[PDB]
């Protein structure tokens, strides 16, 4: 029962549909977005790395890895994970705007462990992780955003990362 009227554009960086687009790394039933290296600063202009997690099976676990503030010297000094309360709070697209929604009301049946490994299931600890339910009734797409563009080192700015999770319906009988 906790949400706010955050408004995000999907990209505060100037790049628009010239995003570098990639799918998740789907091993067995684990679909993984791993922003450890693709967000550290290389080119001087920030660019946008989008990670697309398309799901139409029961019990797909989704793991998203964003690097923490200062886990390496100088490289991720100004990361922003939005939504902060995520995986419990996700973003959905509201007319070319991204606004917070509660994930448990969005997809019923969603399995969220309180500790992702032993550490708490929150981007504070640097990985979030959730398992999609056996029945998903309406097609749902939701967003997680992790941003390294504020970080600057050696006159190079880090990249901006978006996860889009697209769930098609399954389990339905109608």
């Amino acid at each position, epitope marked *: 029962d906790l949400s706010y009227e955050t408004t995000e554009s999907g990209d505060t960086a100037v790049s628009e549909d010239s995003y570098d687009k990639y799918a998740s790394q789907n091993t067995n039933k684990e679909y993984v977005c791993d922003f*450890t*290296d693709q967000l550290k600063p*290389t080119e001087s202009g920030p660019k946008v790395k989008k990670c697309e997690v398309k799901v139409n099976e029961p019990l797909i676990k989704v793991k998203i890895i964003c690097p923490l503030k200062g886990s390496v010297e100088k490289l991720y000094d100004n990361i922003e994970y939005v939504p902060k309360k995520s995986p419990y709070v996700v973003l959905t697209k509201e007319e070319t705007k991204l606004k917070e929604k509660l994930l448990s009301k969005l997809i019923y049946g969603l399995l969220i462990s309180p500790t992702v490994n032993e550490k708490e299931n929150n981007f504070k600890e640097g990985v979030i992780e959730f398992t999609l339910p056996p029945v998903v009734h309406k097609a749902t797409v939701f967003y997680f955003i992790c941003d390294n563009s504020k970080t600057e080192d050696d006159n190079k700015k880090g990249n901006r990362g978006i996860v889009e999770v697209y769930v098609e319906p399954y389990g339905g009988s109608l």
Partner: antibody
Amino acid sequence: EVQLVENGGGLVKPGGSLRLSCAASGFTISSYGMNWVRQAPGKGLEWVSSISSGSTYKYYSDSVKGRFTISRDNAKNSLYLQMNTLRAEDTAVYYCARAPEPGLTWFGEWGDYWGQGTLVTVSS
Amino acid sequence: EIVLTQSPVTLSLSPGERATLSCRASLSISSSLAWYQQKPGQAPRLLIYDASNRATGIPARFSGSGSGTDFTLTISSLEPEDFAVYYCQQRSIWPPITFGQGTRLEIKR
């Protein structure tokens, strides 16, 4: 048994166009990302392009983008590259390589098998 | 663009010796490095994938190692068929995916 065979290389005068083919034999292409690498005579290897299965995600080098288009037929087990507005910088041997499916993290046996090479000479 | 510099540019060594090859990265890539052999006028061949796993049918003398910036291919005891040009390649920060420039193995006579 497991082979990757390219045809299509040639001498085109500069600013010309040319279509390059990679036909696989002995395995199904559909579970694999497919790539093109070039190697100018006397230097190392340089990545040209990569395509996902089906064609949902395709990726190019900065020097070939706009000029070159990558495409794939899974049913024909084939990878194709369309090279237009060629320069003498594009003169090289062009290899295709099988890879695991591309990701944000492309961790795997990239370049598990490579093509034979085709020579593309661009001079007047 | 992560630039991968490979040292030494030419290595001379007698067969039956340990051979260590160094690949140095611009910005601490996360062990996505592959190691390739290429002989004169021939297709490249994968030796070590994911910086430490050797490929299927590559001998047991070839052993990849390292982390971060510094990676190392070690060929534990040379054979005449081991003398060729060698290339590292990263895929941690991409597109583009980038190679080294090469290292020769001649035979010491």
